[PDB]
Amino acid sequence: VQALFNEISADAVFVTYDGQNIKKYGTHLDRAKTAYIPASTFKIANALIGLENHKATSTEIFKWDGKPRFFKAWDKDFTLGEAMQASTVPVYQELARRIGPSLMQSELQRIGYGNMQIGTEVDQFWLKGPLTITPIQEVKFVYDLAQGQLPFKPEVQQQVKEMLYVERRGENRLYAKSGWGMAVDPQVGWYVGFVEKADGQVVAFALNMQMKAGDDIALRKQLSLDVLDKLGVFHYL
């Protein structure tokens, strides 16, 4: 496995969690216990909090306001599920404003997410701070989501799980979310999720890497799939 980390001069770590054991792979293992903004990985929590507190539904359509967004791809209507996969920040900023600065702070504290700090602006905190979370915190969190063990209603955790559904290989399923924290120095890269393996075993993962400005968008996922293949968690079909 070991070549395919530095072959690109990457400052990165890959974490796996099986519900008893934490495993660390990569060029820089100490990133695993290091705190970073969640960026768009926070969308997982955001949806959970919104659904649980009746501020949104899995079926509701978030319509485009007509004004151009960061990507032309985002210039359309989205469900929270669609917006999750496209990582459509404007939709989730809206969800967060429905939630509110007091409720969002209370809920994050309630579920112990990262350092539990959001500050004054409810639609910015995951994008620039002060909310921070380690990769180990991220894997445990999604693993808990996978098992329906988070402090949310079971139906809520299920609905979000479905939002995360990325690919099926045979009897195995991949659930994942991406993050790119551009508004921070240095930039940070996330690929987070779990695989529901055929044998019924769940393995949760997190990739956390330094982002050297504008490198390729697909890199985070490609590495994680490669590592997942190398680990025998999610073999290439």
Author numbering: 44 to 280
Paper text:
OXA-58 is a carbapenem hydrolyzing class D β-lactamase (CHDL) expressed by the multi-drug resistant Acinetobacter baumannii. The enzyme hydrolyzes a variety of β-lactam antibiotics, including penicillins, cephalosporins, and the last resort carbapenems. Structurally, β-lactamase has a loop-rich region that includes the highly conserved Ω-loop. The Ω-loop of the class D β-lactamases contains a pivotal Trp residue that contributes to ζ-carbamic acid formation on the Lys base catalyst residue.
